[PDB]
């Protein structure tokens, strides 16, 4: 019913996603439902302050879609299960997107702020574990789907924003529904 | 710190005969255990392996039976397959790996380099080419 | 400072009708002018071009006849074609480019976006799609 | 006949070579005898001191070669020319190489010292120039060829080391002789 525009869970090697503060999101291997090794990013600057970390996916082609759907699979670490328990330690992140007809995005061009980047939505975590558990506790990883506007350019980029939480982006999957609702 | 990637391949020459490989990784660093893809040329047939992380016992008896922690399913001749390790004491990820400072960890493959033997559970490569990894954390 | 790359394609849209596009690069800056590979999506075809850096007189008359400094020969649909500009006063590269602060440099392309149009030397997309660049260095 | 293993005057995009101190070598476009656009690297920090900049190539397969040949095309700025005439300007640079059975070269492993990197030779410039003259002064672009001992692993890297100079690597070309003399 739907056609996938980027899956990240097929990589088997670095995704090549851009990380604004290099001291923010960092690419790390993980697993999934079936212990299949996958590419994921994570952030946990819980002990540091004033957090504003950006993860930008590479260029995704629109392949003639009008409404993009973004399915996110992520897990959040309880601030409690962590040795250090400073202030803040959020568990909600922002999903943005930027259009463009050509890649052209550099390490600085698509300004790292909600200015050029149009906000899709703020995602919360309705589940946060305190103990890793490979294979078990599926209901512990989160799954949130959002969709953004009309989109007409050749393609676009997505970007996730962290501001002091301790989470993991297990899987991302852009796509569009090729059949009217 | 990044730590040079461990190219899990028969000609990785760091897998010292009779011993295997030792590392001494510290909390805070990353490590890629990669399986090379066969190049158009230069690469004489891909080498299939199923790399697992096990305990000392299972590692010296070269057996993955009972329990184990999968890491690599090197069965993709056209792609580099890897596993990025993060020696962290606490995973912000459910279904993520955790390492305790001052403990030992052993990665093994009881595969035999062929697709037909990709799922063996007894020796070969581990037993044979001594392809074992011992990580001393802390 | 690495300035946003400038995609040289009919849909770059930063090409305003009238004067084209202006930047104001600063000495020490780096800019890449790129010719897109080929989006297999839509009617999307490769737009052949042959970009040059000419005289203000030339960019106004949208003509590349005589006096030329080639930049891109966009005729390889199978892959990106670029030119990394380094606004520097003194080039260590013999056969290199040197931009002296407070002076204007123009870039045009009299091609029309196709072969049998690729080698045209006047008008073309320069006056058609306003595909021009004016760089006020300082 | 020869067997080229790498060229660079054939990329028309980013070569992707590793520059140790980003302050040194940098990727910049230039031309060739025939005014065709090529990818070149350059260094020219005659103003600062304590220079030791490294440019590292991407993995180069041996493909059965035993004795590798490395052809270099480069130009040197005759310091008297540079507006801020310092006094140093070394008209020499070093060619190094590193063997390996797999890429594995991170941005820190193939140590940036001469020990792990076995030296090929120190290349010197025959001519330097003052006026950048496109298509002209053909005799001002230096071309030097060196070769290094039997290589045995699956591949190798090359590294060009600068230590206070103003040059431009215009072209590099790695190859070997199919059959001995």
Which sign, positive or negative, has the C-alpha torsion C62, C3, C75, D2? positive
- What is the distance between the alpha carbons of residues D46 and D163, in angstroms, rounded to a whole number? 9
Asked if C4 lies within 8 A of A154 by C-beta distance, the reply is: no
Which sign, positive or negative, has the C-alpha torsion C12, C13, C17, C21? negative
- What is the distance between the alpha carbons of residues B14 and B117, in angstroms, rounded to a whole number? 23
What is the experimental resolution, given in Å to one decimal place? 2.7
Q: Is A135 on the interface with B (CB under 8 A)?
A: yes
**DSSP-based three-state secondary structure for A29:** strand
Q: Are D178 and D1 in contact (CB under 8 A)?
A: yes
- What is the distance between the alpha carbons of residues C62 and B43, in angstroms, rounded to a whole number? 53
Q: Are A153 and A101 in contact (CB under 8 A)?
A: yes
- What is the distance between the alpha carbons of residues D74 and D128, in angstroms, rounded to a whole number? 10
Q: What angle do CA A79, A82, A83 make, to 5 degrees?
A: 130
- What is the distance between the alpha carbons of residues B98 and C122, in angstroms, rounded to a whole number? 66
- What is the distance between the alpha carbons of residues C35 and C30, in angstroms, rounded to a whole number? 17
CA distance D12 to chain C (A): 5
Q: Which of residues 15-44 of D touch C (CB under 8 A)?
A: 26-32, 35-37, 39-40, 42-44
User: Which residues, including other chains, have CB under 8 Å from residue A65's CB and lie 6 or more apart?
Assistant: A3, A5, A151, A176
* Strand pairing report for B30-35 and B6-7: parallel
Q: Are B107 and B53 in contact (CB under 8 A)?
A: yes
Domains of chain D, with CATH numbers?
A: 1-181 (2.60.120.260)
C82 DSSP β-pair partners: C34
Asked if C12 lies within 8 A of A107 by C-beta distance, the reply is: no
Q: Which chains touch A (3 or more CB pairs under 8 A)?
A: B, C
Residue A157: phi, psi to the nearest 5?
-130, 155
Residue ranges of E strands in A31-91: 38-44, 53-56, 60-61, 68-76
Strand order in the sheet with C132-136: C21-22, C132-136, C104-108, C49-54, C70-74
Query: Most distant CA pair in chain C: distance in Å?
Result: 44
Could you tell me the CA-to-CA distances from D173 to A119, A167, D7, D59, D166 in Å, in that order? 48, 47, 4, 13, 21
Short-list B136, B123, B134, B137, CA closest to B15:
B134
Short-list D70, D75, D15, D43, CA closest to D161:
D43
- What is the distance between the alpha carbons of residues B17 and A181, in angstroms, rounded to a whole number? 62
- Which approach determined this entry? X-ray
Q: Is C89 on the interface with D (CB under 8 A)?
A: yes
Which sign, positive or negative, has the C-alpha torsion B7, B13, B15, B21? negative
User: Which of A102, A107, A155, A156 is most worth mutating to test chain C (most C CB atoms within 10 A of its CB)?
Assistant: A102
CA distance D18 to chain C (A): 17
Asked if C80 lies within 8 A of D77 by C-beta distance, the reply is: no
Query: Most distant CA pair in chain B: distance in Å?
Result: 43
Could you tell me the CA-to-CA distances from D8 to A46, A129, D96 in Å, in that order? 45, 50, 17
Residues of B in contact with D106 (CB under 8 A): 2, 4-5
- What is the distance between the alpha carbons of residues A13 and B34, in angstroms, rounded to a whole number? 9
Could you tell me the CA-to-CA distances from A71 to A31, A159, A169, A173, B112 in Å, in that order? 17, 13, 11, 5, 39
Asked if A13 lies within 8 A of B76 by C-beta distance, the reply is: no
- What is the distance between the alpha carbons of residues C29 and C88, in angstroms, rounded to a whole number? 8
Residues of C in contact with A104 (CB under 8 A): 4-7, 34
What is the residue range of C26's domain? 1-138
Asked if A64 lies within 8 A of C42 by C-beta distance, the reply is: yes
Both tokens of C102, joined, read 């407070």
Burial-class residue C55 by CB neighbours within 10 Å (0-12, 13-18, 19+). middle
**DSSP-based three-state secondary structure for A92:** strand
Both tokens of C123, joined, read 């008008």
Asked if A154 lies within 8 A of C5 by C-beta distance, the reply is: no
Both tokens of D154, joined, read 């699956």
- What is the distance between the alpha carbons of residues D157 and D103, in angstroms, rounded to a whole number? 9
Work out the end-to-end distance of chain B between its first and last CA atoms, rounded to an integer number of angstroms.
14
- What is the distance between the alpha carbons of residues D60 and D37, in angstroms, rounded to a whole number? 23
CA atoms within 13 A on the CB side of C11: 17
Q: Which residue of B has its CA nearest to A46?
A: B92
Could you tell me the CA-to-CA distances from C25 to A38, C32, C91, C131, D38 in Å, in that order? 42, 12, 17, 18, 22
- What is the distance between the alpha carbons of residues A84 and C84, in angstroms, rounded to a whole number? 47
Residues of C in contact with A105 (CB under 8 A): 4
Residues of C in contact with A101 (CB under 8 A): 7, 9, 11-13
Asked if B83 lies within 8 A of A29 by C-beta distance, the reply is: yes
CATH number at residue B40: 2.60.40.420
The number of beta carbons lying within 10 Å of the beta carbon of residue D82 is: 18
User: Which residues, including other chains, have CB under 8 Å from residue D169's CB and lie 6 or more apart?
Assistant: D25, D40, D41, D42, D55, D72, D73, D74, D160
Report how many domains make up chain C.
Answer: 1
Q: Is A126 on the interface with B (CB under 8 A)?
A: no
User: Which residues, including other chains, have CB under 8 Å from residue B48's CB and lie 6 or more apart?
Assistant: B74, B75, B111, B113, B114, B115, B117, B118
**DSSP-based three-state secondary structure for C120:** coil
Q: Are A56 and A105 in contact (CB under 8 A)?
A: yes
- What is the distance between the alpha carbons of residues A123 and B114, in angstroms, rounded to a whole number? 45
Asked if D101 lies within 8 A of B11 by C-beta distance, the reply is: yes
- What is the distance between the alpha carbons of residues C38 and B128, in angstroms, rounded to a whole number? 49
Residue corresponding to tokens 């001519």: D127
- What is the distance between the alpha carbons of residues D176 and C75, in angstroms, rounded to a whole number? 31
- The secondary structure of chain B, three-state, reads CCCCCEECCCCCCCCECCCEEECCCCCCCEEEEEECCCCCCCCCCCCEEEEEEECHHHHHCCECCCCCEEEEEECCCCCCEEEEEECCCCCCCCCCCCCCCCCEEEEEECCCECCCCCCCCECCCCCCCCCEEEEECC
Asked if B42 lies within 8 A of D154 by C-beta distance, the reply is: yes
A68 DSSP β-pair partners: A148
Which of A61, A104, A108 faces C7 most closely, judged by CB atoms?
A: A104
Give one word for B24, left, alpha or beta, with left for phi > 0 and alpha for psi -120 to 50: left
User: Which residues, including other chains, have CB under 8 Å from residue D165's CB and lie 6 or more apart?
Assistant: D43, D44, D46, D51, D76, D89, D90, D91, D92, D93
Give the burial string for D38-73 (b: 16+ CB within 10 Å, else e).
bbbbbbbbbeeeebebbbbbeebbbeebeebbbbbb
């Amino acid at each position: 019913a739907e056609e996938t525009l980027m899956d990240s869970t097929t990589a088997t090697a670095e995704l090549g996603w851009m990380v604004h503060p290099p001291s923010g999101w960092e690419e790390v291997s993980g697993y999934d439902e079936n212990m299949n090794t996958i590419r994921t990013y994570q952030v946990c600057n819980v002990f540091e302050s004033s957090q504003n970390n950006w993860l930008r996916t590479k260029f995704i082609r629109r392949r003639g879609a009008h409404r993009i759907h973004v399915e996110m699979k992520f897990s959040v670490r309880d601030c409690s299960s962590i040795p250090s328990v400073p202030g803040s330690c959020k568990e909600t992140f922002n999903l943005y997107y930027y259009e463009a007809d050509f890649d052209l995005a550099t390490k600085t061009f698509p300004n790292w702020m909600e200015n050029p980047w149009v906000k899709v939505d703020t995602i919360a975590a309705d589940e946060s574990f305190s103990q890793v558990d490979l294979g078990g506790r599926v209901m512990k990883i989160n799954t949130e789907v959002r969709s953004f506007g009309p989109v007409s350019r050749n393609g676009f980029y997505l970007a996730f924003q962290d501001y002091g939480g301790c989470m993991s982006l297990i899987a991302v999957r852009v796509f569009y529904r090729k059949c009217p609702r | 710190i990044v730590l040079e990637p461990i190219y899990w391949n028969s000609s990785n020459s760091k897998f010292l005969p009779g011993g295997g490989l030792v590392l001494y990784p510290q909390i805070g660093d990353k490590l890629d255990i990669i399986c090379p893809k066969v190049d158009s040329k230069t690469v004489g047939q891909y080498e299939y392996y199923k790399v697992y992380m096990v305990d000392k016992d299972q590692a010296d008896r070269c057996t993955i039976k009972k329990e184990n922690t999968p890491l690599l399913n090197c069965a993709r001749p056209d792609q580099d397959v890897k596993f990025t390790i993060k020696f962290q004491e606490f995973s912000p990820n459910l279904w993520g790996l955790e390492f305790q400072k001052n403990k030992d960890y052993y990665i093994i493959s009881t595969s035999n380099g062929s697709l037909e033997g990709l799922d063996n559970q007894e020796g070969g490569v581990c037993q044979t080419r001594a392809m074992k990894i011992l990580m001393k954390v802390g």
